[PDB]
Amino acid sequence: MMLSLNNLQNIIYNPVIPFVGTIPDQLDPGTLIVIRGHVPSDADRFQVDLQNGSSMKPRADVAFHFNPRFKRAGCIVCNTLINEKWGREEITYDTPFKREKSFEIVIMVLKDKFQVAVNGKHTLLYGHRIGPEKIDTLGIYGKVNIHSIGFSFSSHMRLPFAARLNTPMGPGRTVVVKGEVNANAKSFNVDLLAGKSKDIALHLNPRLNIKAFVRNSFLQESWGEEERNITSFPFSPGMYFEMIIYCDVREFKVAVNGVHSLEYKHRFKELSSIDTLEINGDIHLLEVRSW
Ligand SMILES: CC(=O)N[C@H]1[C@H]([C@H](O)[C@H](O)CO)O[C@@](O[C@H]2[C@@H](O)[C@@H](CO)O[C@@H](O[C@H]3[C@H](O)[C@@H](O)[C@H](O)O[C@@H]3CO)[C@@H]2O)(C(=O)O)C[C@@H]1O
Numbered sequence: 001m002m003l004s005l006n007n008l009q010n011i012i013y014n015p016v017i018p019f020v021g022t023i024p025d026q027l028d029p030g031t032l033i034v035i036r037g038h039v040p041s042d043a044d045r046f047q048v049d050l051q052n053g054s055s056m057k058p059r060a061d062v063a064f065h066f067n068p069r070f071k072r073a074g075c076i077v078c079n080t081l082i083n084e085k086w087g088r089e090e091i092t093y094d095t096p097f098k099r100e101k102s103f104e105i106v107i108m109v110l111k112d113k114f115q116v117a118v119n120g121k122h123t124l125l126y127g128h129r130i131g132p133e134k135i136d137t138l139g140i141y142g143k144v145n146i147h148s149i150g151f152s153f154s155s156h157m158r159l160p161f162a163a164r165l166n167t168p169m170g171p172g173r174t175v176v177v178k179g180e181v182n183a184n185a186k187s188f189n190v191d192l193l194a195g196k197s198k199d200i201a202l203h204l205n206p207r208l209n210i211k212a213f214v215r216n217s218f219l220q221e222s223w224g225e226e227e228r229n230i231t232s233f234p235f236s237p238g239m240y241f242e243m244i245i246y247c248d249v250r251e252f253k254v255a256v257n258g259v260h261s262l263e264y265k266h267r268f269k270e271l272s273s274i275d276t277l278e279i280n281g282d283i284h285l286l287e288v289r290s291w
């Protein structure tokens with residue numbers, strides 16, 4: 001894995017090790033845990049532990065033991081601790097971790113397993129031995145320096161929604177959003193803005209109360225001329241939808257549920273400067289995909 005969208009919540013910076021912190025939400029499937037740091041020049045071993053509570057006597061059960069160890073070979077040791085007793089070790093060699101090297105660990109929770117990627121490469125999978133609903137604390141021990149920890153939950157898609165685009169906007173770039181208009185929705189908006197110039201390159205504003213689709217750009221602290229022509233208002237309150245914002249060389253092509261909706265001639269000509277996605281309004285956000 002390698003997150004295309006940066007929308008981590010509850011960002012933690014430079015935590016002191018050992019760090020024992022409460023996971024601010026339940027680890028439901030689709031949940032991501034992102035840990036960034038580096039291995040000190042001495043480091044013999046360190047561990048990331050998803051635990052059920054933080055009692056240390058008796059030692060809290062460790063639902064998921066992620067234990068990178070540095071030795072001749074070099075590996076990542078995984079296990080589970082119930083009633084202070086270790087279960088069967090699952091060991092992965094060809095360790096992505098190395099001394100004096102920085103890393104990004106993405107721990108993804110699946111219905112039946114944890115899937116782990118380190119530095120954009122798949123590293124290992126881990127079957128749940130303890131229900132994940134029982135995990136509420138993150139423990140980090142050993143010789144490792146933590147720069148930042150971040151999370152992505154179900155609420156991670158709560159509104160207002162803001163997210164950075166880890167891949168510059170440019171021709172061929174697609175952005176899709178799936179969601180559902182609320183039953184009594186007035187309107188909602190999806191914007192592509194340029195963080196730098198705090199400009200709104202594309203403002204897609206479906207308004208359900210007036211059955212119209214306002215499209216415009218906000219540049220130089222000002223709204224331009226609106227674009228509302230459309231063969232037919234595609235949105236209806238309470239309706240599930242998927243929207244495709246496709247950036248092309250001269251304009252944006254936007255479709256809803258597999259049917260073309262409109263085109264929008266680029267007003268912000270620095271396509272690459274479009275590094276932000278904002279979603280807000282009267283809808284239920286279900287999914288967002290950059291690429
Ligand atoms: C030294 C200390 O302060 N406590 C350690 C503990 C203790 O060594 C003791 O195990 C407490 O019960 O070890 C901790 O790491 C252990 C953990 O990584 C488990 C995971 O399987 O392995 C233990 O070592 C194994 C070893 O991998 C096997 O090859 C061997 O056959 O058995 C050993 C023990 O079963 C690690 O020591 C721990 O959290 O329990 C780290 C503490 O800081």
Ligand SMILES: OC[C@H]1O[C@@H](O[C@H]2[C@H](O)[C@@H](O)[C@H](O)O[C@@H]2CO)[C@H](O)[C@@H](O)[C@H]1O
Nearest residue numbers: 189203205214215216217223224225226
């Ligand atoms: O242009 C998008 C921008 O519109 C603002 O509202 C406008 C409205 O679109 C226009 O038809 C009317 O004449 O003037 C309103 C006041 O500017 C929204 O407030 C803003 O959020 C965007 O949606």
